[PDB]
Amino acid sequence: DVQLVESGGGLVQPGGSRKLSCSASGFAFSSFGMHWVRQAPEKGLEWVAYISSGSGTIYYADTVKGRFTISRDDPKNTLFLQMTSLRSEDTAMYYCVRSIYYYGSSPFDFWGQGTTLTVSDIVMTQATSISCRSSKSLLHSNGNTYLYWFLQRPGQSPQLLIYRMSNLASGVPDRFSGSGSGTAFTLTISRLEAEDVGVYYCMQHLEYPLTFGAGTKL
Amino acid sequence: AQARKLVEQLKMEANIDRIKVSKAAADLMAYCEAHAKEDPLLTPVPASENPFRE
Amino acid sequence: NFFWKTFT
Amino acid sequence: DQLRQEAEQLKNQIRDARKACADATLSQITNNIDPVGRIQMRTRRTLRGHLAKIYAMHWGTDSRLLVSASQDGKLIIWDSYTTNKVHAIPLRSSWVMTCAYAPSGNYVACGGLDNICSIYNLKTREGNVRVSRELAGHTGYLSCCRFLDDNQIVTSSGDTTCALWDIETGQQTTTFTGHTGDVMSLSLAPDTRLFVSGACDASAKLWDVREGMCRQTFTGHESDINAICFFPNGNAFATGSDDATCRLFDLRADQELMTYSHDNIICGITSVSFSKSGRLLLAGYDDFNCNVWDALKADRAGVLAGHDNRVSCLGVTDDGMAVATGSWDSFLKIWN
Amino acid sequence: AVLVPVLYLLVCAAGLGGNTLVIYVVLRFATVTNIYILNLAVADVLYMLGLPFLATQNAASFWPFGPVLCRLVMTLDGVNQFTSVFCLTVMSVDRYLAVVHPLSSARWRRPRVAKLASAAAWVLSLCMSLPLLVFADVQEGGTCNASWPEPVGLWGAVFIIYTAVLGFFAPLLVICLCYLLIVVKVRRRSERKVTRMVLVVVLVFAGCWLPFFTVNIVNLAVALPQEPASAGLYFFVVILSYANSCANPVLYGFLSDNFRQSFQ
Amino acid sequence: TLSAEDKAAVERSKMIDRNLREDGEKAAREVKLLLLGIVKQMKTGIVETHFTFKDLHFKMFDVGGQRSERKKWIHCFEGVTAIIFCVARMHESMKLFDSICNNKWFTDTSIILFLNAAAYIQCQFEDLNKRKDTKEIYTHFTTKNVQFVFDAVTDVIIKNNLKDCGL
Structure with a gap:
């Protein structure tokens, strides 16, 4: 552990x-x-x-x-x-x-x-499937795009869902998916059972000043 | 018992349905020419697609 | 009027 | 003692059958086929992190990551594209002779003079690499080992026999005895059902994993068979021996089809590999070189010469884009 | 005469050919002895390439290239000579360290520490050449030698004394002590081979760098000459100093069981 | 040109290189002796015996328990500091000593002969070898054994460093 x-x-x-x-x-x-x-x-x-x-x-x-x-x-x-x-x-x-x-x-x-x-700096927008949009293209010349998804359940710390928009983290059910072109990214959930309620954040890792989104709540 | 082992193995290793060498050579050539379009070692590859540039 | 290496 | 006489009579009969099955030769048919031409490739990458002789290497399934084993007791994972080091696993015993990369990519294996095969897990939750298992039971040193699945592995030793293992239990499930001399080579079929092995005695045998008995036996060499490789189609294989010869055997004709010899080169052969289409045949010699033979015709077309010492290992990627070559001067090059 | 100017370019050609052969062979194999013979060969080739301007100066006693070029060429030649001597001393001390105290120096046997030692030698040699470059009011015509508005006796005294005591004499003491007692510790088959190399190195260095410095110092004090015989002696002394630069690659990079077997 | 993740990966590779160099520097201080032919009283493949004497790490590789063709794995012992050969019938020992002394991999590795009218057999044994310039044979009639091994290894390492430096 x-x-x-x-x-x-x-x-x-x-x-x-x-x-x-x-x-x-x-x-x-x-x-x-x-x-x-x-x-x-x-x-x-x-x-x-x-x-x-x-x-x-x-x-x-x-x-x-x-x-x-x-x-x-x-x-x-x-x-x-x-x-x-x-x-x-x-x-x-x-x-x-x-x-x-x-x-x-x-x-x-x-x-x-x-x-x-x-x-007592790249801008990400989550004004509003989950949607996220970036000011500049996160896709790189080597073929890697850097956008990470985090889920924060009420009363708990965030946990990683999907890194680089496509790779599912260990211990995460296969129901979550991520896709999208440059500057427009989306997250898909098949069926919404319990323990899937919280706040979703999209984060970028391309220049070391790292900007988080406003967040989306269900 | 090495002689017994050999004489026991020979019966199965001899009873195999073999085909003529010409058919095997024809099949080998057919495989070689059929797949001779996606091997980046016979024909040169453009530098724009080679991942081992520089 | 002579120094190191060559004349001067 | 009449049983051995009957066995010799059976050997003579099967030799007569082999002679009968031969009606044409590869060279006669391939004479009209156009040649490949001179092959020139350069060292695109050079990987410099080993402090001793390099004895094995193996490409990953993705054909980007590779693994190398050296005598400084080290097993290094290389990112081929950028020459980065991903992992550096230290070994308990520095006398190593073999590498293996699991097709899934989660495990590596190594063996040698310690007579055991150690399997390491590459993807743990603690952030390091730990020894998943140690397999023991062989009496002689380990010459080769190759993964089948995440839980099956085939090894060959100097006990003149090969073995199949179950990694979740650590006990052998099959044995493939039948050879006379030390087994030095090993090659799994693309189908992962058949299996082939060459030995110190000039003979190579074909095994079935699910039954564990020798289907076929091939002879023709005069010295130790040092390397074997499977054709990309699985219906033939190539054997490289100590007497500066390579031979192409077939599993249906059950006779040799072609030999690769030249008077200029008289040395041993350390490694043999094919290419993606089967037209090319790499081979590594003791004379500090790696000659690029040709399959359809024996004519030698190309030489790779950049190593100060003899070349021990030779690998070709799954997609056929690069050829890695390690050697005794503690460097390995990638040729394209 | 006509042969004295010619042998300058002859020495240049021979030294350049030998040194480029050594530098070509060294770079295509690799250890630290290679990384130090690299520095020695670089210093030698630069030192030889700096000469030919003086060679054409000495013939007609006239030098048409501009004072700003002479004021840097002379200091470059000086820095090359000092760097070569310092590299020789450092290589001798490195041989002593590797042979006599092998294990305790593993921290200083790394490639990085050798590189910083070489850089320290280069910068230390560079520091001594700035006074020469900044104070030499190069003559705008003929021989562009050193000059000072201040009384020249004091300048000559300080320059010669700090070039001879530290630049030449101290390396000679270090090398001689280092190369001598290493034979004593060994003591016979190995020793006999070692003795000839040490003796030839010390003798060549001493006989190539002593006469130039001694005629220079004897000239400064009292004996200002005028006869052409003294001029010929000076000219032969200069090429005598250049002879060590010519002969170093042969005596180091050629006569060694490692190098000639390696080239095969 | 390079991403943040690529920079971090390059830094990790540099750390791996530094650790590899440190491990190599550590391992270079030990000397390896290949036993061939009961000296382990005073101090299933390779049985490495580890000991220290006069602040110098000694590895002793006993490979006699292999029961296979020696020509296939002896090349793995290139670069060993010394081959400790043992001789106690004597014709077979002489034959295998001649075989191991004239091997192509062992044309520059020193051999320490250990014994467990004497002048005649000693001269014969040292005369079995053919090439005597850069190879030496050290003989001791079996406290003193470990000191003799230390002195012989010191001489071999002195000669090796002297040749490596080019002197």
Whole structure:
């Protein structure tokens, strides 16, 4: 069993630093890159920061750049996010995501359980089968298009459904399908039984500033 | 018992319905020429379709 | 008026 | 002792039947057929990550990923298109002689002087590669092994016999004894029903997986048969021996049809493979070269010369787009 | 005479042919000794290619190519000579390290550390050539040698002393100590073969780089000459220094059981 | 030109290369001795015996329990530091010593002869070999055995490094 448990957080006055920690167990932690993804109580998911395997490559969001820092301790299998000069915009729930990149792998596999924090670019559209549209073409010269589907059941963390628009994730029933040309993507569900109710998000992975959709609810 | 094993195996290995060599050669040539259109090692392939460019 | 390598 | 005399009489009778079945030759019919012409190909890719001699390689079903085994105790997965490394599995024993890639792509296998065959699972939930199973029971070293399904595998050893395995239980289900010398080669049919094997004694035998007895036996060589390969149609095969000769045998005529020899080259033959259409015949020699023979006519048309040392392995993709060639200088090239 | 200018181009042709043969053979096989003989051959070919301008200067005592070209050509020649000497010293110390202390140096046997060592040698040789390039007011006509508005005695003293003590003399001490005690540790069949190579290397280097520096230093102090005999001595001294550049590929890249068997 | 996933894959490949180089550097410090012909008292294919002496890792490969044609797998032992040959009737041992000493793969690998009127047989054994310039034969009449093996391997490795450097 793979476990990702986040700790820390709470109530902090504006302008006060804080540290978030995530402990990983049940898998080879040193072979995986890690992401922090936050979601607002009234908005959708928003990518925060990313650290690769071996800590040799780091990216930050353009709205938290400078204030935040992301680090990993491999002997202890732990991931830290140091946050400084907090404002009212950072009141959000933070999740830790793991992803591994080689030929044929499935990134954004396992999501942890978030911690609540309270303080007191390609555009994707989900204004409206599930539909999603992108500002620019996600298709690449090598034949790969990068669009990922996530489903968030009520009261739980998101889980991966389909990566690169066509490959079904492990443990997912064969009923879900994904298709579409460039800048227009669709998700198909055969029959809607229970446990299929939630919020669906479409995410792009082509330039490291990663943009999530507004989300679609059933 | 190697002699017994050989003499026991020879009876089945000899009773096989064989066809003339000419028919086998004709079939081999027919297979070779029938599929001689999708082998990117006899005829050159354009560089626009070769996945091992550069 | 003589230096390294050649004349000067 | 009359039983052995009757056996020799049966051998003479079957040899007479073989002579009777022969009425024409391949060369006479193929003389009028136009030739292929000079074949020139270059090293499109060169994979440099091995620190010792490379003894085996095998293409994946998708014809993009490949696997290599070397004597530094390493088994490396290569992305052919971009020369990337996907996995690097370390082995318990560094004396390895064989590779295998599962048709599904989830498993690899390796064997050698350890007399056991180790099967590794490539797609786990923990993000690493772990040893799925170890198969034991052979007395001699392991020469070749090839997957049939996710749960069946055929191996050949120096015990002068071959074996079929059940991976979910780890016990052999069939045995294919009958050879006299060490088995050095192995080739599964495209139909995955028939099977062929060559041995140190100059004889190659055809086996059935579902019954496990020798259907046919072929002779004609004078030294050890080092390599065997199946024709793309499954009705013939090619055997490469230590005496600088290749021969094309048929499963219906039950006699050899053609030999591939040249006075300039007198060495051993280490690997043999066909092409997609069956017109071409690759072969690897001990003299640092890989001559590209021709099937219909024995005339040699083409040479691949880029290796500092002798070529051990030779593979051709399923779609016939590239030819990978490893060797003893610790590099393997892709030729197109 | 007419033969003295000719032998300059003759030496250039011979050195270029031998060195391009060595560089062609080396690159088509690959170890670190190859990656160091590569640096040595590159330095040697650049050092030989820098010469012929001086060869045509010495004949007519006139040099029509512009001062901005001379002020860089002279410093390039100096940097090539210093790089060649430093590469020789580093290769000697690398042989000593590989033979005597084989295992403890595995961190420094990597390709990366050898590359940074070579780069350090190149930049260290480059640092010493900037004073030569920036201060030499190249003569706008005839011989474009070094000149300084400040008194030339002090400049000559500092330049010659820091080119001789560090550029030549210190490598000679390092190489001689390194190549000598390695024979003692071995001590006979192996030793006899080693002794001849070490002796020939040290003797060739000393006899090719001592006379030039000594005539240069003796000239600076007191003996300013005027006779044509001294001019001929200087000319023969210069090609004597170039002789080491000519003969290094043969004595290193040819007389070695690895190289000649490898070419086969 | 390259996607983010492609960049991450290239970084993974570079990490794999670094680990391979580190493993090779680790493995290069051990010396491999091929036993051929009871020395394991003091310290189903290959039975590798591992030991350490004077801070140098020694692998001992005992391949005598194979019962197959030696010409098919002996080539796998190219590049071994030394062949530890053992001799205790003696005509068969001389014949197989001559066979193994003049093999094409073993024209440059040192042989350490171990024994378990003596001058005559010793001269005969060292004279069985044909090529004596770059191959040496070390003889010891069987504490002292491991030290002699260490010294002989040190001499072989010194000669090998001396030839590799070109000196």
